[PDB]
């Protein structure tokens, strides 16, 4: 019942969580986020979760500090106290062949605009 | 009756509080803040809130890991202790589906602002 | 506001910015922020480091 | 401030425009560099 | 709208609370 | 124990027995809230909305 959705190029894991029986969705990162803090924030969202674990189904525990992009290709088995969930990642399409240089030019240019805007209150912060 | 308006680049959300029944406003950075920091700010500013949580309008709860601006692309339902608030003024403006035209808008505004300040004279004044 | 004493306080106002230019600059700020959020720059940014 | 006496202690010892100029040149670095390369 | 009634020897005062706007009672 | 415990002690025990609970209350047969320092025997006179 747990689904993984790409929103803005980011995985969104919506989980049917315990006692307050809701869907809670998690906006993640492939690189900067890892399993060791994903499980930390999953334990944060419901304090009553006793034992939480995750593993590829042949494994017994996928390792802590596993890259989430390594996990975004395989059917991990998500483990909650009473509940198990082996679920799949969706497909990630790409136009990084002929729109690559154009879109990366746009990414570089807007990042230069953002570091034009944000640098002034960071220089003084770093000085303090 | 929750509104949000962009004052000087920052979203200024304004919200009704239960204790003392005064409307309060919250100016928050779209980048350095998560929604968990915002809910800490709600329960920190006025301690009359037992439970607060942010619902995406599909009933799914937005957990405390996402970015603010990632949540500001959508409208969303804010739940103070009993009163709910579907807040929809975040001014979703990127309906163009063309990034290059938005950069044309960017350099249009930048050239307009470059001209209206007569800033090239200020730069020559700096060199002088 | 202190205990039942509403001291209405003003600053000595210095504007140093026109209103139309403030609106244009606010539009620039919010538009760059919305595009930063839209095309997920920080993902590509950390991707270069990786 | 002590109870009676007073030490006059003597120790020894725009902003929008700069931002929008950096913003203006940020739009027009790449074409300027591509011209200057040739 | 605050009342107080003597239930079984103790004053049971009942009072409105701001947060959640529920009336609460206090036996003291 | 009705002779020693108040409502708040029972509610903190119910609080610590789990962790995924944040809001607990004991209401009247009416809508009003029984406080924390109320004795249990006064609460066990009648029913209650837990």
UniProtKB/Swiss-Prot annotation, chains A, B:
Region N-terminal MCU domain, as annotated, extends over: 2-92
* Gene Ontology annotations for the cellular component aspect, listed alphabetically: calcium channel complex; mitochondrial inner membrane; mitochondrion; uniplex complex
On modification after translation, the UniProt record reads: Phosphorylation by CaMK2 in heart leads to increased MCU current. The regulation of MCU by CaMK2 is however subject to discussion: another group was unable to reproduce these results. Phosphorylated on tyrosines by PTK2B/PYK2, promoting oligomerization.
Modification Phosphoserine occurs at: 19
Compartment annotation: Mitochondrion inner membrane
Q: Does the keyword DNA repair apply?
A: no
Q: Does the keyword Calcium apply?
A: yes
Its main subcellular localisation, reduced to a broad class, is: mitochondrion
Protein's job:
Channel-forming and calcium-conducting subunit of the mitochondrial inner membrane calcium uniporter complex (uniplex), which mediates calcium uptake into the mitochondrial matrix. MCU channel activity is regulated by the calcium-sensor subunits of the uniplex MICU1 and MICU2 (or MICU3). Mitochondrial calcium homeostasis plays key roles in cellular physiology and regulates ATP production, cytoplasmic calcium signals and activation of cell death pathways. Involved in buffering the amplitude of systolic calcium rises in cardiomyocytes.
Its quaternary organisation is: Homotetramer. Component of the uniplex complex, composed of MCU, EMRE/SMDT1, MICU1 and MICU2 (or MICU3) in a 4:4:1:1 stoichiometry. Interacts with CCDC109B/MCUB; this inhibits channel activity. Interacts with MCUR1. Interactions with MICU1 and MCUR1 are mutually exclusive. Interacts with SLC25A23.
Protein name, per record: Calcium uniporter protein, mitochondrial
- Gene this chain is encoded by: MCU
What residues of the intact protein does this structure contain?
A: 74 to 201 of 351
Swiss-Prot record, chain F:
Q: Any idea where this protein resides?
A: Mitochondrion inner membrane
**Upregulation:** MCU transcripts are down-regulated by microRNA miR-25. Down-regulation by miR-25 may protect cardiomyocytes against oxidative damage in cardiomyocytes.
> What modifications does the entry list under PTM / processing?
Phosphorylation by CaMK2 in heart leads to increased MCU current. The regulation of MCU by CaMK2 is however subject to discussion: another group was unable to reproduce these results. Phosphorylated on tyrosines by PTK2B/PYK2, promoting oligomerization. Undergoes proteolytic degradation by SPG7.
Q: Per its UniProt entry, which superkingdom is the organism in?
A: Eukaryota
- Provide the assembly information: Homotetramer. Component of the uniplex complex, composed of MCU, EMRE/SMDT1, MICU1 and MICU2 (or MICU3) in a 4:4:1:1 stoichiometry. Interacts with CCDC109B/MCUB; this inhibits channel activity. Interacts with MCUR1. Interactions with MICU1 and MCUR1 are mutually exclusive. Interacts with SLC25A23.
Give the similarity note: Belongs to the MCU (TC 1.A.77) family.
State the function annotated in the UniProt record. Answer: Channel-forming and calcium-conducting subunit of the mitochondrial inner membrane calcium uniporter complex (uniplex), which mediates calcium uptake into the mitochondrial matrix. MCU channel activity is regulated by the calcium-sensor subunits of the uniplex MICU1 and MICU2 (or MICU3). Mitochondrial calcium homeostasis plays key roles in cellular physiology and regulates ATP production, cytoplasmic calcium signals and activation of cell death pathways. Involved in buffering the amplitude of systolic calcium rises in cardiomyocytes.
Copy the domain comment.
The selectivity filter, in which calcium ions are arranged in single file, is composed of two acidic rings separated by one helical turn along the central axis of the channel pore.
Protein name per the record: Calcium uniporter protein, mitochondrial
Source organism of the structure: Homo sapiens (Human)
Which gene produces this protein? MCU
